[PDB]
Amino acid sequence: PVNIFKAGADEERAETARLTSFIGAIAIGDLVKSTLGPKGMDKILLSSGRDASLMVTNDGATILKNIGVDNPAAKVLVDMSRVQDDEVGDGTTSVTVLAAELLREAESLIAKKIHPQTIIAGWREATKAAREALLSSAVDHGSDEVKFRQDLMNIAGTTLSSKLLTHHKDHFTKLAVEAVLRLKGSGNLEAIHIIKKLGGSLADSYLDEGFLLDKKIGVNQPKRIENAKILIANTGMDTDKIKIFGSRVRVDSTAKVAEIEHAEKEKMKEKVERILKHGINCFINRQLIYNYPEQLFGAAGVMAIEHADFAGVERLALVTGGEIASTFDHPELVKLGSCKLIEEVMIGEDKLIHFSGVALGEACTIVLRGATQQILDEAERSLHDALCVLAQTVKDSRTVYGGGCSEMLMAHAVTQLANRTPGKEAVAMESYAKALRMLPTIIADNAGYDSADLVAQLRAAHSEGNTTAGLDMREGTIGDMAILGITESFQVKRQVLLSAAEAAEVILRVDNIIKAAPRKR
Amino acid sequence: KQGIPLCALINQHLSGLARKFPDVKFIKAISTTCIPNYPDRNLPTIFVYLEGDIKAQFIG
Amino acid sequence: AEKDNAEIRVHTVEDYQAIVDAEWNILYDKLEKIHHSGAKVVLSKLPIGD
Amino acid sequence: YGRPFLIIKDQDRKSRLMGLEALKSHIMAAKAVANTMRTSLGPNGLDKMMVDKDGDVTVTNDGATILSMMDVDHQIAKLMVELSKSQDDEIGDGTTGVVVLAGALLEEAEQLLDRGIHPIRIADGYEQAARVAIEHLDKISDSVLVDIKDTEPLIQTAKTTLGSKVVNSCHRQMAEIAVNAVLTVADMERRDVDFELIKVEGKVGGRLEDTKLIKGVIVDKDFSHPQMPKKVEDAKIAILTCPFEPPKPKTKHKLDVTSVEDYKALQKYEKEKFEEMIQQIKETGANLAICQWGFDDEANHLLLQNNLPAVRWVGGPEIELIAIATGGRIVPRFSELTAEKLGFAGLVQEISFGTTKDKMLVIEQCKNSRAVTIFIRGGNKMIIEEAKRSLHDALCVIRNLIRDNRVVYGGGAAEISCALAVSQEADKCPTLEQYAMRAFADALEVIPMALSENSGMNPIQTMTEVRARQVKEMNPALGIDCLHKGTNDMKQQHVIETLIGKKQQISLATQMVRMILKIDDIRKPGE
């Protein structure tokens, strides 16, 4: 009955708090529900204080990234999308819209004066049963090369439906596949290189049979080399300061200073000869280099490459068969990088150095000669997501069925459980099951088909036991993806459902929203 | 990080300033050993400290 | 540093190494005095180096 | 007065309240704050999610974390923030209970003070009631089973402690992990441990079941100069606090150079220094090196082509615990390097998390450690925070129950037993004082009613019938069936928590009720 908060500090300890949270959640859900299925249309994140910076995106990750809110539940869901995108890729859309539908269920349930803990326990049990059922339906492959390759092709093709690049799916999905082949079973993500060069077409893009570098060369370096013996270095080479300090030159005549200069030139030449004793035809420097070392190298006539990148040099050491060195007393204890030819290439209006016939091909370099910067940015986002999915499906070989197939499978399993369950939970779980039914429904809504007809047909098919039944998105019919080729990652859907479950658990267990008094701005 | 004429000229200017104001504590070092793997695209960054409180900043 | 105003003027690397090892020897000799003194705990206003 | 004046500077700018009605004002807030928290009691509690002044979302169930980052304007509000923080400082969950109980005492105090009774007599009665109740409660409390081989009683205690927060989602592996960790880290000879002997690190991604206990070392760096193999088998390690570089003395040093011979002397000096550092380390018989303050890439490649894995740039206490776990020793400098003090590890590996750039170094030592670490794989930053808070509370509770004969059955029942005890105490007492003990008991009954209200079922008649049961039944510890599982007996429902927690909560609430009752004047500014 007495004021206790600071000016600007608010507390809603009634259903108005959940009302505000729910309307914010719905505002989140509808904004992204247009970015799902093969029928999604992209959105614009327009700025006014960011000096008019815009980005077009389809995977709602960036959308929730670029929008804030005062209602803390919407920020909770934004962080949930953050997590989801941190795991694999697309599905943030899925998990967010699913959370919207489940909170709408919660709305309908609270509309009947029910203690939410019953809902919580029932959803716990329903999630346990659904995860068990899906695991029992987990279809696995990789025992055959052709089968596993076709599974990856199906996953990639299905995934490109959710984004723009579908227009050249056959020229993109398959290509991405070979990229993860070049990983050679290594778990690294940071070997694939992303390149954006406006101009040209997405079909004009290609995967080169080698590697490329985008750094300046030294003053006198040859343009082309064959059978390059390659070494990578990280030292001074910038008049190679002695690294010792608290030492001073203190003389009374400048002849000694002249001799010191001559001696430092000689010492630098000694370092150069120390390096050349190993014997190379191509040198790499992660950082800059000075004029006198450049003249010495030109006397040697080798390739010196200056001011490279830490991640890039790590990648190239993985690639060409060498490792970075910093001391050169051992022409015997180092492995040298190897390539067939190192030439010059002009791409876009930027200059690149081309590695052709590299001894190995672990890392990857994907050049995008697209047509606009914004399409380039969204293309790189999409390929990042796709390669993350590819890496994840290479990691765990188990796969699942999309087009609602697994979805209606768990829906029907929860249906039967609720049927054999007494109490409110059952219908709640049934509504929970109904909640799941909304997910493929919205997909059809993206297509704009006969919604209720299709949902009824799928429920009838899954009640009949046809466990491969799905939705045909090419015409609006019901078929088998085993014929069609619509397969997805078991890990992806599994974690989608589990994360959605725990997010619902945490969101439903709220009772009082208290926004602290703003500091200032 | 020594090597760029930016950092070299800044070091020259501050060293010459030391000749004028011997009442100011100057500190120079390699940021790599001061901050691990510090981004080399963020130099030379001027820091103004007293009692552990940043008063002035001049970054990059 | 000794008294915050001490200056070191040497001419070769051997002198440098001798001086730094000598600083270490001062440190470790104080440590030896403390340890061989027999006390099990030490307290002070002044900071204790790592 | 005949003429106006002022004795107080800005006398008309500061307000002044007094009298018993002034107490009313505090008691006013005594509703809201208590009424704020009454909604979260029970294992099926309904958490609170709120924003700080900067724009961060926090969800939790305990009292102290709620009250701290809650914007509090009234001064009783800040007093109660301090109160719940102290309660957390001692126990953990139940902070909500302390707030609710102290509040309920405050409303009943306002109700009964209207009769015109001396507040000092009220405080005396409350103190007598509290001491009698605590005496009886400690008398009745039974003994707990603690062992290094038997853990199930403590597993049930921990599981009950998880019966206040979200962590009851798994609720089984958590108790086992907590008991194992507290047993491993604990100092045996003194019945004590220190939580700085424990590290908690929570990483996004994963599932609640992925939560695990490692009696090893978790480091968040990777193989320095990472173009070497990303793991190794059993490793022998030396621990250094110095970089790999010709050191500079603390004193202003000036090396005079006048000859090109001194130039070559400097070159020889640096090269021989690096090579002798390598000779020293590789010669003493280790495989792994760790550097507190990093070092230069020259020594990096020297370590690489020597095929001796190494790491650098590690935090201080991190290295301290690393040395603790490996059993080796931190050598301050190369002179004191010895083979005897090298450490040994059962396994070290680099975690890639599939797609994230970050890598953490997991280390399982060849030998056990008196330090254990916690790693979390979840799907929300806020849930990570809540899990960490719950784990800290669980370790605190397990340390609390490390003492024998300290268990009692709660569940809103021991409050009933003490209520009967204090009712009798009032009976064996003249009037004019016994109203205080009546109020004490009525406040005692408050918590079970809130519990049942959090069950959404009929609170009052269930509470009265269970009280009648405990009076009639032979079980002095029978509580409330709050999860549709049947009986009301605690000995088979296993709402198991430490007695010291309840004694502390009761005494602390009594002291703060005294503190509020003692004061009646406020002089404050309003500009």
PDB file of N, CA and C in Angstrom, chain D residues 152-184:
ATOM      1  N   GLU D 152      22.951 -42.140  -0.327  1.00  0.00           N
ATOM      2  CA  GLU D 152      21.533 -42.023  -0.649  1.00  0.00           C
ATOM      3  C   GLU D 152      20.753 -41.116   0.300  1.00  0.00           C
ATOM      4  N   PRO D 153      20.965 -41.160   1.624  1.00  0.00           N
ATOM      5  CA  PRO D 153      20.305 -40.149   2.470  1.00  0.00           C
ATOM      6  C   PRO D 153      20.671 -38.732   2.073  1.00  0.00           C
ATOM      7  N   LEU D 154      21.951 -38.495   1.800  1.00  0.00           N
ATOM      8  CA  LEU D 154      22.369 -37.183   1.330  1.00  0.00           C
ATOM      9  C   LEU D 154      21.905 -36.925  -0.098  1.00  0.00           C
ATOM     10  N   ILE D 155      21.783 -37.973  -0.918  1.00  0.00           N
ATOM     11  CA  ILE D 155      21.189 -37.797  -2.241  1.00  0.00           C
ATOM     12  C   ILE D 155      19.758 -37.293  -2.116  1.00  0.00           C
ATOM     13  N   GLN D 156      18.987 -37.871  -1.195  1.00  0.00           N
ATOM     14  CA  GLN D 156      17.614 -37.423  -0.986  1.00  0.00           C
ATOM     15  C   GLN D 156      17.575 -36.006  -0.428  1.00  0.00           C
ATOM     16  N   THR D 157      18.491 -35.675   0.486  1.00  0.00           N
ATOM     17  CA  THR D 157      18.554 -34.307   0.996  1.00  0.00           C
ATOM     18  C   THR D 157      18.810 -33.316  -0.134  1.00  0.00           C
ATOM     19  N   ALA D 158      19.806 -33.605  -0.973  1.00  0.00           N
ATOM     20  CA  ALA D 158      20.121 -32.728  -2.092  1.00  0.00           C
ATOM     21  C   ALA D 158      18.945 -32.631  -3.050  1.00  0.00           C
ATOM     22  N   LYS D 159      18.317 -33.769  -3.348  1.00  0.00           N
ATOM     23  CA  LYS D 159      17.161 -33.786  -4.234  1.00  0.00           C
ATOM     24  C   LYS D 159      16.040 -32.915  -3.686  1.00  0.00           C
ATOM     25  N   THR D 160      15.827 -32.960  -2.370  1.00  0.00           N
ATOM     26  CA  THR D 160      14.857 -32.072  -1.742  1.00  0.00           C
ATOM     27  C   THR D 160      15.260 -30.615  -1.921  1.00  0.00           C
ATOM     28  N   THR D 161      16.547 -30.315  -1.738  1.00  0.00           N
ATOM     29  CA  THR D 161      17.012 -28.947  -1.943  1.00  0.00           C
ATOM     30  C   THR D 161      16.757 -28.483  -3.369  1.00  0.00           C
ATOM     31  N   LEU D 162      16.881 -29.388  -4.341  1.00  0.00           N
ATOM     32  CA  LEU D 162      16.471 -29.077  -5.702  1.00  0.00           C
ATOM     33  C   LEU D 162      14.963 -28.934  -5.819  1.00  0.00           C
ATOM     34  N   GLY D 163      14.218 -29.361  -4.804  1.00  0.00           N
ATOM     35  CA  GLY D 163      12.789 -29.142  -4.778  1.00  0.00           C
ATOM     36  C   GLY D 163      12.441 -27.726  -4.373  1.00  0.00           C
ATOM     37  N   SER D 164      13.133 -26.753  -4.962  1.00  0.00           N
ATOM     38  CA  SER D 164      12.702 -25.362  -4.915  1.00  0.00           C
ATOM     39  C   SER D 164      12.916 -24.613  -6.220  1.00  0.00           C
ATOM     40  N   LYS D 165      13.705 -25.134  -7.155  1.00  0.00           N
ATOM     41  CA  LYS D 165      14.132 -24.394  -8.335  1.00  0.00           C
ATOM     42  C   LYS D 165      13.824 -25.185  -9.606  1.00  0.00           C
ATOM     43  N   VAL D 166      14.323 -24.667 -10.730  1.00  0.00           N
ATOM     44  CA  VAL D 166      14.161 -25.320 -12.025  1.00  0.00           C
ATOM     45  C   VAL D 166      14.940 -26.624 -12.112  1.00  0.00           C
ATOM     46  N   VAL D 167      16.066 -26.721 -11.404  1.00  0.00           N
ATOM     47  CA  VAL D 167      16.991 -27.835 -11.537  1.00  0.00           C
ATOM     48  C   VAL D 167      16.333 -29.183 -11.269  1.00  0.00           C
ATOM     49  N   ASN D 168      15.119 -29.192 -10.722  1.00  0.00           N
ATOM     50  CA  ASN D 168      14.409 -30.442 -10.493  1.00  0.00           C
ATOM     51  C   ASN D 168      13.952 -31.065 -11.807  1.00  0.00           C
ATOM     52  N   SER D 169      14.356 -30.476 -12.936  1.00  0.00           N
ATOM     53  CA  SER D 169      14.053 -31.078 -14.231  1.00  0.00           C
ATOM     54  C   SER D 169      14.745 -32.428 -14.390  1.00  0.00           C
ATOM     55  N   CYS D 170      16.044 -32.493 -14.101  1.00  0.00           N
ATOM     56  CA  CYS D 170      16.746 -33.772 -14.038  1.00  0.00           C
ATOM     57  C   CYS D 170      16.587 -34.387 -12.651  1.00  0.00           C
ATOM     58  N   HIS D 171      17.045 -33.671 -11.627  1.00  0.00           N
ATOM     59  CA  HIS D 171      16.706 -33.853 -10.220  1.00  0.00           C
ATOM     60  C   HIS D 171      17.276 -35.138  -9.627  1.00  0.00           C
ATOM     61  N   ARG D 172      17.921 -35.988 -10.428  1.00  0.00           N
ATOM     62  CA  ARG D 172      18.516 -37.228  -9.946  1.00  0.00           C
ATOM     63  C   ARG D 172      20.034 -37.215 -10.071  1.00  0.00           C
ATOM     64  N   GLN D 173      20.549 -36.996 -11.282  1.00  0.00           N
ATOM     65  CA  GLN D 173      21.990 -36.884 -11.474  1.00  0.00           C
ATOM     66  C   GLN D 173      22.572 -35.710 -10.698  1.00  0.00           C
ATOM     67  N   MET D 174      21.776 -34.660 -10.484  1.00  0.00           N
ATOM     68  CA  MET D 174      22.261 -33.480  -9.774  1.00  0.00           C
ATOM     69  C   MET D 174      22.668 -33.817  -8.343  1.00  0.00           C
ATOM     70  N   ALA D 175      21.824 -34.559  -7.625  1.00  0.00           N
ATOM     71  CA  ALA D 175      22.137 -34.892  -6.239  1.00  0.00           C
ATOM     72  C   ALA D 175      23.400 -35.739  -6.155  1.00  0.00           C
ATOM     73  N   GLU D 176      23.518 -36.731  -7.037  1.00  0.00           N
ATOM     74  CA  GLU D 176      24.702 -37.582  -7.047  1.00  0.00           C
ATOM     75  C   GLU D 176      25.957 -36.770  -7.335  1.00  0.00           C
ATOM     76  N   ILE D 177      25.893 -35.886  -8.334  1.00  0.00           N
ATOM     77  CA  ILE D 177      27.053 -35.068  -8.674  1.00  0.00           C
ATOM     78  C   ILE D 177      27.440 -34.168  -7.508  1.00  0.00           C
ATOM     79  N   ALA D 178      26.454 -33.539  -6.867  1.00  0.00           N
ATOM     80  CA  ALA D 178      26.750 -32.641  -5.755  1.00  0.00           C
ATOM     81  C   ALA D 178      27.405 -33.388  -4.603  1.00  0.00           C
ATOM     82  N   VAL D 179      26.846 -34.542  -4.227  1.00  0.00           N
ATOM     83  CA  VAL D 179      27.402 -35.278  -3.096  1.00  0.00           C
ATOM     84  C   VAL D 179      28.808 -35.777  -3.421  1.00  0.00           C
ATOM     85  N   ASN D 180      29.018 -36.280  -4.642  1.00  0.00           N
ATOM     86  CA  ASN D 180      30.349 -36.749  -5.011  1.00  0.00           C
ATOM     87  C   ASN D 180      31.361 -35.611  -4.993  1.00  0.00           C
ATOM     88  N   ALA D 181      30.981 -34.445  -5.519  1.00  0.00           N
ATOM     89  CA  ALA D 181      31.902 -33.316  -5.551  1.00  0.00           C
ATOM     90  C   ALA D 181      32.271 -32.864  -4.145  1.00  0.00           C
ATOM     91  N   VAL D 182      31.269 -32.658  -3.284  1.00  0.00           N
ATOM     92  CA  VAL D 182      31.562 -32.192  -1.935  1.00  0.00           C
ATOM     93  C   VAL D 182      32.366 -33.222  -1.161  1.00  0.00           C
ATOM     94  N   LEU D 183      32.136 -34.515  -1.401  1.00  0.00           N
ATOM     95  CA  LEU D 183      32.952 -35.528  -0.743  1.00  0.00           C
ATOM     96  C   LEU D 183      34.398 -35.479  -1.225  1.00  0.00           C
ATOM     97  N   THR D 184      34.603 -35.336  -2.536  1.00  0.00           N
ATOM     98  CA  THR D 184      35.961 -35.339  -3.076  1.00  0.00           C
ATOM     99  C   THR D 184      36.752 -34.133  -2.589  1.00  0.00           C
TER     100      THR D 184
END
